[PDB]
Amino acid sequence: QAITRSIADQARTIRIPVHMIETINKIVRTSRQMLHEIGREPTPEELAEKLAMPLEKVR
DNA sequence: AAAAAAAGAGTTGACACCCGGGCGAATCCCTGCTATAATGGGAGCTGTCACGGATGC
């Protein structure tokens, strides 16, 4: 926890909250999984319904 | 020879409105807490000299 909580604050070079970075990681993971087990590339339209988030937020 | 008014000023009410300041509500950032066992690290030159200087017995 100490190594992961501090790596996302100083190494990023810009102020990025923890929830933002965790959402980015989850989105990247789900996008990679969908691109690997669904088709050629996951579109941002279906990423909102897959994660149950608004389109303006995922965009 | 005389003698009053469209403008020119001056206001007086009458809206049209346009950001400001609150009331909300909806939502960001921080911080800590997770209980099987985790126990010393990965590049990098190394195919230029030559000078001019800094350590050692």
Side-chain angles (χ1 to χ4, degrees):
Chain A
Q1 175 259 4
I3 296 184
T4 298
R5 184 62 59 90
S6 158
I7 182 60
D9 299 1
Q10 312 173 4
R12 294 209 63 174
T13 314
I14 52 182
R15 176 48 57 181
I16 299 297
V18 182
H19 65 270
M20 187 60 58
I21 185 60
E22 64 95 20
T23 296
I24 292 277
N25 294 18
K26 290 187 178 300
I27 289 186
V28 171
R29 292 173 60 261
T30 177
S31 159
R32 177 257 182 179
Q33 189 264 356
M34 300 204 67
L35 185 141
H36 281 55
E37 307 295 348
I38 296 301
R40 52 182 67 92
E41 195 279 339
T43 192
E45 279 77 349
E46 54 93 15
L47 289 181
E49 63 181 0
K50 176 62 61 179
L51 302 182
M53 301 180 60
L55 181 60
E56 56 95 19
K57 183 61 180 300
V58 54
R59 183 177 58 89

